[PDB]
Coordinates of C-alpha atoms in Angstrom, one line a residue:
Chain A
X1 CA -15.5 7.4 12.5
X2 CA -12.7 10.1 11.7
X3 CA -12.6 11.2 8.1
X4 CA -9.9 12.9 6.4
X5 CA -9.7 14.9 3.6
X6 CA -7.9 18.1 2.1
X7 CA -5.2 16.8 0.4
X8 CA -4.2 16.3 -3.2
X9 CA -1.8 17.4 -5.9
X10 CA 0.1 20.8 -4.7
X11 CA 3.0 22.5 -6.8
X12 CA 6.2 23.2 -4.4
X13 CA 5.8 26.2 -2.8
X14 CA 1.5 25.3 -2.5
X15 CA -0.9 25.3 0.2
X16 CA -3.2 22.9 1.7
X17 CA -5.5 22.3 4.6
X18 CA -6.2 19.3 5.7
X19 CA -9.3 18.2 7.9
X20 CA -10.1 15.2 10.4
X21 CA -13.0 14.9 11.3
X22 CA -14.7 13.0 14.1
X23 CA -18.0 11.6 13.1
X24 CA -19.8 10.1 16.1
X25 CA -18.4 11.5 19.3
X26 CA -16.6 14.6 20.3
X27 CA -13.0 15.5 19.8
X28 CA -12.6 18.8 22.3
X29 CA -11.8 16.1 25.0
X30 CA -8.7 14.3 23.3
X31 CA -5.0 15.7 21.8
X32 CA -4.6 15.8 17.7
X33 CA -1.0 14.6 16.6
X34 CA -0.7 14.6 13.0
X35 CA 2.1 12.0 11.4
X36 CA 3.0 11.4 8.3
X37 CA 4.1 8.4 5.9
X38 CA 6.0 8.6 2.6
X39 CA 5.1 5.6 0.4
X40 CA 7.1 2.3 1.4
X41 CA 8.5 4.3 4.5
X42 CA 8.0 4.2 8.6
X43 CA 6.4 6.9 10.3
X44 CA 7.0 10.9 11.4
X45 CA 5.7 13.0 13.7
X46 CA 4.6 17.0 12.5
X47 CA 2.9 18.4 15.0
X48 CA 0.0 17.9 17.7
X49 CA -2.5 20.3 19.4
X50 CA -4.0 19.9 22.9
X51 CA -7.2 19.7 24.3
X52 CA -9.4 22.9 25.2
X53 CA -8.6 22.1 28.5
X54 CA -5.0 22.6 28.0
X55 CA -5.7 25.8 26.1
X56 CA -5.0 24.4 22.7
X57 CA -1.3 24.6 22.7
X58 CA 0.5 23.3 19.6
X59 CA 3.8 21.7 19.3
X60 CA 5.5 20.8 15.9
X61 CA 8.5 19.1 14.2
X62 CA 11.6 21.5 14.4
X63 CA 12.4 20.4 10.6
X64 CA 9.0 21.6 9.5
X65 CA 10.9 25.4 9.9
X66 CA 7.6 27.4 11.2
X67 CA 5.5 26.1 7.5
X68 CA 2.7 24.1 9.6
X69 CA -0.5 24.9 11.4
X70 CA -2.1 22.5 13.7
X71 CA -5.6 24.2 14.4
X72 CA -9.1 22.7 15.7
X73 CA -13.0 23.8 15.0
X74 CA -14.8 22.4 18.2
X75 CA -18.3 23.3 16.9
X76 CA -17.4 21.3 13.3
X77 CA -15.9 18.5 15.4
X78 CA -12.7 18.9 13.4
X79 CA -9.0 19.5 13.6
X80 CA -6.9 20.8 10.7
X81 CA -3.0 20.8 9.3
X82 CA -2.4 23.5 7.4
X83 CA 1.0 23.1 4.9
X84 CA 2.7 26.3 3.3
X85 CA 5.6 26.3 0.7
X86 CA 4.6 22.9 0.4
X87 CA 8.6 20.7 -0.5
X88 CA 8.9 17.6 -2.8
X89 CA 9.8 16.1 0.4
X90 CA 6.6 17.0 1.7
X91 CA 4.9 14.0 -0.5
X92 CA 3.5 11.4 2.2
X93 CA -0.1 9.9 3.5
X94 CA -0.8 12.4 6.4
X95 CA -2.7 11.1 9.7
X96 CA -4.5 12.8 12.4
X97 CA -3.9 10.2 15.9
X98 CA -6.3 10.7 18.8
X99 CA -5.3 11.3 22.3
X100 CA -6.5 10.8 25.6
X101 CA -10.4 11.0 25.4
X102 CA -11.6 8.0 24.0
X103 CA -11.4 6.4 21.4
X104 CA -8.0 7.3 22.4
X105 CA -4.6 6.2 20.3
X106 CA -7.4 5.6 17.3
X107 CA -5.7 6.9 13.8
X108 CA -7.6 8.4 10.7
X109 CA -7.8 6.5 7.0
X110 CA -5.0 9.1 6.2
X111 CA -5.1 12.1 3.0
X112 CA -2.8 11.7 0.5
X113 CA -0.7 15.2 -0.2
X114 CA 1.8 15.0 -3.6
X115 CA 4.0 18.0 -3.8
X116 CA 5.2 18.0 -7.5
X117 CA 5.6 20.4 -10.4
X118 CA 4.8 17.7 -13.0
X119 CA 1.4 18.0 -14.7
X120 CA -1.5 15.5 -13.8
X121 CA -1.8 13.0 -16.1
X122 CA -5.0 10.8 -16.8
X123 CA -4.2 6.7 -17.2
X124 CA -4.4 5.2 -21.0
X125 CA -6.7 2.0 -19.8
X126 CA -7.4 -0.9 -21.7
X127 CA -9.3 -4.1 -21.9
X128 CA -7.1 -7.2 -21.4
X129 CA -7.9 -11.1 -22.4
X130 CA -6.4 -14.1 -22.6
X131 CA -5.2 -15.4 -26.4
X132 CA -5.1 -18.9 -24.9
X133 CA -8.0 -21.6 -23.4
X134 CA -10.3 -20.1 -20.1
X135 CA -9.2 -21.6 -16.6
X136 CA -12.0 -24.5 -16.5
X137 CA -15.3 -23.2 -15.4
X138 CA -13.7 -19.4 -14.3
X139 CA -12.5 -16.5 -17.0
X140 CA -9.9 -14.1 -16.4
X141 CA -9.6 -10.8 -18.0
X142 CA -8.2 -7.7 -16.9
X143 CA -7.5 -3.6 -17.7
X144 CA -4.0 -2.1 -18.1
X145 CA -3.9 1.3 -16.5
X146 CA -0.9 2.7 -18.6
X147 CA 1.0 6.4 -17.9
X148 CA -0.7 8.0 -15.2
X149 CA 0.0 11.2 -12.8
X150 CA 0.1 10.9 -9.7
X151 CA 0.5 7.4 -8.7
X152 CA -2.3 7.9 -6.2
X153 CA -4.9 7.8 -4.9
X154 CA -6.2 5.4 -7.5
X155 CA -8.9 2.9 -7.4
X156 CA -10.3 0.1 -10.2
X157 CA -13.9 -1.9 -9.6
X158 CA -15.4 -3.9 -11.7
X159 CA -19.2 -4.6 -13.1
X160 CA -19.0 -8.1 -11.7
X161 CA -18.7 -9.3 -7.9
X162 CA -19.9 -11.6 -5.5
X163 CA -19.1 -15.4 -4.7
X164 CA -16.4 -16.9 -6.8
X165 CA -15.3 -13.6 -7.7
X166 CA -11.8 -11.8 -6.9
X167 CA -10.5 -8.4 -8.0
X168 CA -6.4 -8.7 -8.3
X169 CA -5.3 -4.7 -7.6
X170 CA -1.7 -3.7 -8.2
X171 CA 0.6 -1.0 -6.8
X172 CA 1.7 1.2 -9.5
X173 CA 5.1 1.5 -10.8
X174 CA 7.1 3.6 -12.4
X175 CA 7.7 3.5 -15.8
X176 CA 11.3 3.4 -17.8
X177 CA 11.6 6.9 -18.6
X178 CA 9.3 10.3 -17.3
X179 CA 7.5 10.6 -14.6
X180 CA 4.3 8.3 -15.5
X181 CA 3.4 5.0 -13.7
X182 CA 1.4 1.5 -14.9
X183 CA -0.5 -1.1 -13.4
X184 CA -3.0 -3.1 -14.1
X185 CA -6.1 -4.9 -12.4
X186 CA -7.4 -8.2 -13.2
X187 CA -10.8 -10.3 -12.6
X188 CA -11.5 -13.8 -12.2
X189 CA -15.0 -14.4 -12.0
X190 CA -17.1 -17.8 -12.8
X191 CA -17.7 -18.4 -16.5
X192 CA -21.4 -18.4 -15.9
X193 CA -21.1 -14.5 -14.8
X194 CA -19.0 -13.8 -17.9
X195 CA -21.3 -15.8 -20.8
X196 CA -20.0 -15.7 -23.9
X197 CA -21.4 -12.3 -25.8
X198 CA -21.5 -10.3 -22.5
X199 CA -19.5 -7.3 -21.7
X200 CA -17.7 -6.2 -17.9
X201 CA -16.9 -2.9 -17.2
X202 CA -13.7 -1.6 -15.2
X203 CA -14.2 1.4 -13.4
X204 CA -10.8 3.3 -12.8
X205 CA -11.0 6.9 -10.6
X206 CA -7.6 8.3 -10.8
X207 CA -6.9 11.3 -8.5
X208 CA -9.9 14.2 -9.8
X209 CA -9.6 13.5 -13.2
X210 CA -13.2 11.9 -14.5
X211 CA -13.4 8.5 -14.1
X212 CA -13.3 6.4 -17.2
X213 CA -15.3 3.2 -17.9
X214 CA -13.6 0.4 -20.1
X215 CA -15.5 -2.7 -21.8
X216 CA -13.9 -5.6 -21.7
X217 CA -15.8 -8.7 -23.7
X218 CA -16.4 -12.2 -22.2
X219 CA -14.5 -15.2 -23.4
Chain B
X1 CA 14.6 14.1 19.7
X2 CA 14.5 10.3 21.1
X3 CA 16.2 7.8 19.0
X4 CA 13.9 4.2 18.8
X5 CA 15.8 1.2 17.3
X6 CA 14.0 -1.6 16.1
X7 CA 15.6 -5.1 15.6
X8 CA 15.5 -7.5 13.7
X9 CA 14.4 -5.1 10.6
X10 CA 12.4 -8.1 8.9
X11 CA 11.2 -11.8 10.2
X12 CA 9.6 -14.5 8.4
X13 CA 8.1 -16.9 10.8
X14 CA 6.1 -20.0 10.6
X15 CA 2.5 -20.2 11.5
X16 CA 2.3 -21.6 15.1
X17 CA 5.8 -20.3 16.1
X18 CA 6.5 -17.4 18.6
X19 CA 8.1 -14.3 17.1
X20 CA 9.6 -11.3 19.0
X21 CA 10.3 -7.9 18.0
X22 CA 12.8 -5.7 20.2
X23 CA 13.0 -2.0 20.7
X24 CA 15.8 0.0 22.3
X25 CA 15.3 4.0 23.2
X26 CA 18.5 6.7 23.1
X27 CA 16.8 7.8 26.5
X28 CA 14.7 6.1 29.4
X29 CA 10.9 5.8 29.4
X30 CA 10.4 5.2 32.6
X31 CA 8.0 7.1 34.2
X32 CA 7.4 8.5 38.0
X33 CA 4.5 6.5 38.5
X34 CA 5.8 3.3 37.3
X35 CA 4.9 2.5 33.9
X36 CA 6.7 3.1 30.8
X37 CA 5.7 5.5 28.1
X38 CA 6.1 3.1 25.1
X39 CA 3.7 2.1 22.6
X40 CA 3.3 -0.8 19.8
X41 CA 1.4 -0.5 16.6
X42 CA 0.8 -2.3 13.8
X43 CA 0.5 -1.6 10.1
X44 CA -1.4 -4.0 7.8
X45 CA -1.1 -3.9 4.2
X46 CA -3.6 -1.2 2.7
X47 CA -4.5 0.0 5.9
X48 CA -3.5 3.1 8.4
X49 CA -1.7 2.3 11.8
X50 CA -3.5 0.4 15.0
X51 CA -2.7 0.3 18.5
X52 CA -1.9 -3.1 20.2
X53 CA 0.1 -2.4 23.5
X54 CA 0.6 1.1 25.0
X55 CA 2.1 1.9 28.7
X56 CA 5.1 -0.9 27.9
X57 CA 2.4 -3.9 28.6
X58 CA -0.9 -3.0 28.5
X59 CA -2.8 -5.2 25.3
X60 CA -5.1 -2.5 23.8
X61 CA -9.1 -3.0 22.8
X62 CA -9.3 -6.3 21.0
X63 CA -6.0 -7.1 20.6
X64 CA -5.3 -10.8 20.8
X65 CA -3.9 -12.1 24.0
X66 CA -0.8 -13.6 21.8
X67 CA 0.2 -10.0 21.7
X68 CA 2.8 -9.1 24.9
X69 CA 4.9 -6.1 25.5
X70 CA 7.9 -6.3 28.3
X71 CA 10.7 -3.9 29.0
X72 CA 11.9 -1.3 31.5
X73 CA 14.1 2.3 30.7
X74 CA 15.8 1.9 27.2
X75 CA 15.0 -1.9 26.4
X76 CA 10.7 -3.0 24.9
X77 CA 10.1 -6.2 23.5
X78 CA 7.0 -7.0 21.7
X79 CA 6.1 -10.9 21.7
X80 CA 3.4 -12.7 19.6
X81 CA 3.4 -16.0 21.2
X82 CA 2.2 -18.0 18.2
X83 CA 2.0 -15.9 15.2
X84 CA -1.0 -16.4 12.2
X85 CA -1.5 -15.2 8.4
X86 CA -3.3 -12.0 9.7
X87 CA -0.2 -11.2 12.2
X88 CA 1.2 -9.9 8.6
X89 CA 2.5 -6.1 8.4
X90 CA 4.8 -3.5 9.9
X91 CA 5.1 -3.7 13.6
X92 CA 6.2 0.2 14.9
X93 CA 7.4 1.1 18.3
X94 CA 6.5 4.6 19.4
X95 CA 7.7 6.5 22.6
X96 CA 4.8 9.1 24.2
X97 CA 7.7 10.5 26.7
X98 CA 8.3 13.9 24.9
X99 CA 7.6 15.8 21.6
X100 CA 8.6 14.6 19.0
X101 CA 6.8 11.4 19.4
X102 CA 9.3 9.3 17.6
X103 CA 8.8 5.8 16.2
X104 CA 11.2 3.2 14.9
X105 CA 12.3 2.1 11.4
X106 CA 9.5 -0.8 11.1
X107 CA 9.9 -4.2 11.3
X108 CA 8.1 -6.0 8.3
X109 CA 6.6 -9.3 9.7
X110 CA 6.2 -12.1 7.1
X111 CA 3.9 -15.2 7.4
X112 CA 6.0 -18.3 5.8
X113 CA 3.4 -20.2 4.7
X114 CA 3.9 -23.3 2.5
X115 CA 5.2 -23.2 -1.4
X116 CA 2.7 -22.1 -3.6
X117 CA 3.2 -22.0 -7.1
X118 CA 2.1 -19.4 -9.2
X119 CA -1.1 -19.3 -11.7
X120 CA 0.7 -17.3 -14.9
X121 CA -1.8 -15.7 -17.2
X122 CA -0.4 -13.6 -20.9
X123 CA -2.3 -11.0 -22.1
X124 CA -1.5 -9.1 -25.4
X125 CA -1.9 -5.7 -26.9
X126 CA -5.1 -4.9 -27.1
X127 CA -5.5 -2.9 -30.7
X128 CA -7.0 -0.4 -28.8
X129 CA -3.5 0.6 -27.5
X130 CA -2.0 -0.7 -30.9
X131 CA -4.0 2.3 -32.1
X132 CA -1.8 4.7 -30.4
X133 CA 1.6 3.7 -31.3
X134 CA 2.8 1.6 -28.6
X135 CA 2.1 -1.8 -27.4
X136 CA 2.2 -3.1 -24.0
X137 CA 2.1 -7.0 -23.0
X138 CA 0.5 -7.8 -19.3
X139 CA 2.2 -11.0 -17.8
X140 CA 0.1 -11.5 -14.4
X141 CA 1.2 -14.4 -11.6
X142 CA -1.1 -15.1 -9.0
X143 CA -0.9 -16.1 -5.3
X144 CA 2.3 -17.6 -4.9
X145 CA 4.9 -18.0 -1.9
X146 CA 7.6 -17.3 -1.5
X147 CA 8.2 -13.5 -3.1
X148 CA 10.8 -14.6 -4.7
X149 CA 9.8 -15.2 -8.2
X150 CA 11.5 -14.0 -11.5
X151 CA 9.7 -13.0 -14.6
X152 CA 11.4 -13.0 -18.2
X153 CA 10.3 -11.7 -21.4
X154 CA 11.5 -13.4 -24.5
X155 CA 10.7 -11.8 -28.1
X156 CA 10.8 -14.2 -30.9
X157 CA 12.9 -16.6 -28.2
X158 CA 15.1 -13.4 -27.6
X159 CA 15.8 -12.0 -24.1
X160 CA 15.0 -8.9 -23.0
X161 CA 16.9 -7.1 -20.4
X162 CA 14.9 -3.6 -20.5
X163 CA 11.5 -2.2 -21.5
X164 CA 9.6 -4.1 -18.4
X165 CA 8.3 -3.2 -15.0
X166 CA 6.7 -5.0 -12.3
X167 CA 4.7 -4.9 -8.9
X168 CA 4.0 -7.2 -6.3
X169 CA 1.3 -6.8 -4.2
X170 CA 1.5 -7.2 -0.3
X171 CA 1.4 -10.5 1.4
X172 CA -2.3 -11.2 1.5
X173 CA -3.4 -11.0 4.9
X174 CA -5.8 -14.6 4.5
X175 CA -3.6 -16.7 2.2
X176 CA -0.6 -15.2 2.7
X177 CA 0.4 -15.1 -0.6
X178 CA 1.8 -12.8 -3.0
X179 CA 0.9 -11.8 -6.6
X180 CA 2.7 -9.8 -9.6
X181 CA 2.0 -7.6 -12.4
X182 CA 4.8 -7.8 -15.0
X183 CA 3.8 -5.0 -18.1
X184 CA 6.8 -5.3 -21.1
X185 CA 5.7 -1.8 -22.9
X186 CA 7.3 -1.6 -26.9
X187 CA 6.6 0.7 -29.2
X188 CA 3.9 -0.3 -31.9
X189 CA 6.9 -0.7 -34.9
X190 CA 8.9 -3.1 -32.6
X191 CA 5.4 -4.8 -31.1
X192 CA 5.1 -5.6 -35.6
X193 CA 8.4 -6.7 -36.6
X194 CA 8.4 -9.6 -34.1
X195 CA 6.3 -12.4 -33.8
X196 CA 6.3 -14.5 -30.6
X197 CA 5.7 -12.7 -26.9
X198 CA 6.4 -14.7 -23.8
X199 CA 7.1 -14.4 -19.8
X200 CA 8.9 -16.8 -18.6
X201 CA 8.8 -17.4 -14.5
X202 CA 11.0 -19.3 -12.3
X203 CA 10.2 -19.8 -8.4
X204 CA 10.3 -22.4 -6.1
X205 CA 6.8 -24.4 -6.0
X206 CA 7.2 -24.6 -9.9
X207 CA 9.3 -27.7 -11.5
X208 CA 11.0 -25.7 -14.0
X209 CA 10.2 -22.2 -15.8
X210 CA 7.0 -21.9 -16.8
X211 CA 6.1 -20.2 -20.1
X212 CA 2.9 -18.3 -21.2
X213 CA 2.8 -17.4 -25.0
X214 CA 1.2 -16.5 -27.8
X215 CA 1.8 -15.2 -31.7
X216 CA 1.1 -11.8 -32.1
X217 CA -2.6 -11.4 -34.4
X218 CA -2.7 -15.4 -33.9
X219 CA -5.6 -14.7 -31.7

C-alpha cells in the first residue's frame, strides 16, 4: 500500500534518501509529512510537502538547520526525504503520513536510518536446547543471536510453522560493555513436528549482512 | 511550536472498564468553521501509527465505536468506553493547526489481565559458542502477567549481580501477556571452573521462586 525504503546504516556526516511509495492509487492528490521515531520514544515531525495543486511547497522542522529535502516523483508515485550530515541524533524509524486525498491520515511501515560511526557487525548465532525433560507432547528449542551491529532491522524464522506452533522473538539489548546487542528467539512446536533425529533451521537476516542458517537438533 | 500534554503518562485498566486519556494544547485548536484541529492515534506494539479520531470527534475508518474523542480550544479527551486486550499500545494526540505538527509524550495503555505465571525454560552453552571462548546461558520466561518479574542467576548457589541482560517483549496484543529473555554471558574459563548454572524467578502468580538448573557437561 505504501512502501518505504532507503534507509540503513549511515556514518555522521552521511547521506540518505528515502522513498514512500504508493502502490495502488495515486499520491499527487494528497500532502507527504514525514515523522520520525527514535526507539522506545513518541513521535517528531521533519517536514511535509504539498500537493501539485498547492505547487509543492515544503515546510520542515526548524531544528533540522536547512539538512532535509522533502521532494516528490509524480510519475513513480513516490515522495522522498533526503538527510545530509546525517547526526547520531538522527537515529530513528522514519515515516511518510498521507494527507488529504484518500487514503488520507494512512502512515507507511516506516525505514529504519542508524547514524553511527561503529562498524557493522554480523550476530554469533547458536542452536539452543533444553538439558532437562521436553514439555509433554511440545519441544522447545531456540537460537541465541549474540554481538550484533546495528540492533536493527533484524528478523529470525524458523523451518517449522503452522498449528501448535509459536515463534517467541525478542527485542535486542545491549550488552555489558561495547557497542554490540543479544537476543535470542525461541520455538515451541508439537513433538510430532520435531521427531527425535530431525533437524530445524533458524533463519536470522541481520541488517545487509548475508543471512545465516543455524541447525538446531530435535529432542 | 504547539505544546501537547498528555495525562496520565501510563494506565493499566481492566478488561471491561472505561479508560480515558486527556490532552491539553499550549494554544487553541479551534477552528473558524467549528471543528477542532486535533487528532488521536494509536501505536500497537511492532507496528507504525493509526488514525482513530481526527477533527476532535470524528471515529476514523473502522475504528470501534468504544473509541470517543471530546474537547473544545486547549482541552481533548479520548475515551474507550470499555477497553479489550487488543486496546494495548501508545495512544498519541496530534494537533493539524500549524507546522510543526506536534504530538504528545504517549500514553502507554496496559490491559490488566489476570496473574499468569510464567513457563521458565534453561538453556546452556552450546559447545559451539564454548568453541570461541565465551559462554552464554539463555534463561527464557514465557507469557506471564504482571511485567513485573525478577530473574536471578546463581553460579554454584552463588549470586550474581553483573554479567546478565534481559528483554521483555511487549504486551501481547491477544493474551496480553508478557515474555523475557534473560542471556548471563561468561567467559569460557569462568563458564569451566564452576559447575551448577541457574535462574531463579520471582513474580506474583508463582508460590515462591522458581528455579531452572542444570550441571554444566551433565547433559
Amino acid at each position: 500500500q505504501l512502501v518505504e525504503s532507503g534507509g540503513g546504516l549511515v556514518q555522521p556526516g552521511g547521506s540518505l534518501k528515502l522513498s514512500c511509495a504508493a502502490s495502488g492509487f495515486t499520491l499527487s492528490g494528497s500532502n507527504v509529512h514525514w515523522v520520525r521515531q527514535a526507539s522506545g520514544k513518541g513521535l517528531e515531525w521533519v517536514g511535509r510537502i504539498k500537493r501539485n495543486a498547492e505547487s509543492d511547497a515544503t515546510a520542515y522542522a526548524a531544528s533540522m538547520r536547512g539538512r532535509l529535502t522533502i521532494s516528490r516523483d509524480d510519475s513513480k508515485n513516490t515522495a522522498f526525504l533526503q538527510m545530509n550530515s546525517l547526526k547520531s541524533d538522527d537515529t530513528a524509524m522514519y515515516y511518510c503520513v498521507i494527507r488529504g486525498d484518500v487514503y488520507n491520515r494512512q502512515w507507511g511501515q516506516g525505514t529504519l536510518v542508524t547514524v553511527s560511526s561503529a562498524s557493522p557487525t554480523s550476530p554469533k548465532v547458536f542452536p539452543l536446547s533444553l538439558c532437562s525433560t521436553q514439555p509433554d507432547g511440545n519441544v522447545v528449542i531456540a537460537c541465541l543471536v549474540q554481538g550484533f551491529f546495528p540492533q536493527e532491522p533484524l528478523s529470525v524464522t524458523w523451518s517449522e510453522s503452522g498449528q501448535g506452533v509459536t515463534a517467541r522473538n525478542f527485542p535486542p539489548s545491549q550488552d555489558a560493555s561495547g557497542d554490540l546487542y543479544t537476543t535470542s528467539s525461541q520455538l515451541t512446536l508439537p513433538a510430532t513436528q520435531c521427531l527425535a533425529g530431525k533437524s530445524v533451521t533458524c533463519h536470522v537476516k541481520h541488517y545487509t549482512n548475508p543471512s545465516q542458517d543455524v541447525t538446531v537438533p530435535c529432542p | 511550536d504547539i505544546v501537547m500534554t498528555q495525562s496520565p503518562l501510563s494506565l493499566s485498566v481492566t478488561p471491561g472498564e472505561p479508560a480515558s486519556i486527556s490532552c491539553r494544547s499550549s494554544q487553541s485548536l479551534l477552528r473558524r468553521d467549528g471543528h477542532n484541529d486535533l487528532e488521536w492515534y494509536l501505536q500497537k506494539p511492532g507496528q507504525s501509527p493509526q488514525p482513530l479520531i481526527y477533527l476532535g470527534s470524528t471515529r476514523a475508518s473502522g475504528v470501534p465505536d468504544r473509541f470517543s474523542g471530546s474537547g473544545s480550544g486547549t482541552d481533548f479527551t479520548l475515551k474507550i468506553i470499555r477497553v479489550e486486550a487488543e486496546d494495548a499500545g501508545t495512544y498519541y494526540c496530534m494537533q493539524n493547526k500549524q507546522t510543526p505538527l506536534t504530538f504528545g509524550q504517549g500514553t502507554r495503555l496496559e490491559i490488566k489481565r489476570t496473574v499468569a505465571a510464567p513457563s521458565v525454560f534453561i538453556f546452556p552453552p552450546s559447545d559451539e559458542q564454548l568453541k570461541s571462548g565465551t559462554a552464554s546461558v539463555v534463561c527464557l520466561l514465557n507469557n506471564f502477567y504482571p511485567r513485573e518479574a525478577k530473574v536471578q542467576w546463581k553460579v554454584d548457589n552463588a549470586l550474581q549481580s553483573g554479567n546478565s541482560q534481559e528483554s521483555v517483549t511487549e504486551q501481547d496484543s491477544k493474551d496480553s501477556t508478557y515474555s523475557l529473555s534473560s542471556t548471563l554471558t561468561l567467559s569460557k574459563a569462568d563458564y569451566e571452573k564452576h559447575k551448577v548454572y541457574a535462574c531463579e524467578v520471582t513474580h506474583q502468580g508463582l508460590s515462591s521462586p522458581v528455579t531452572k538448573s542444570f550441571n554444566r557437561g551433565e547433559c
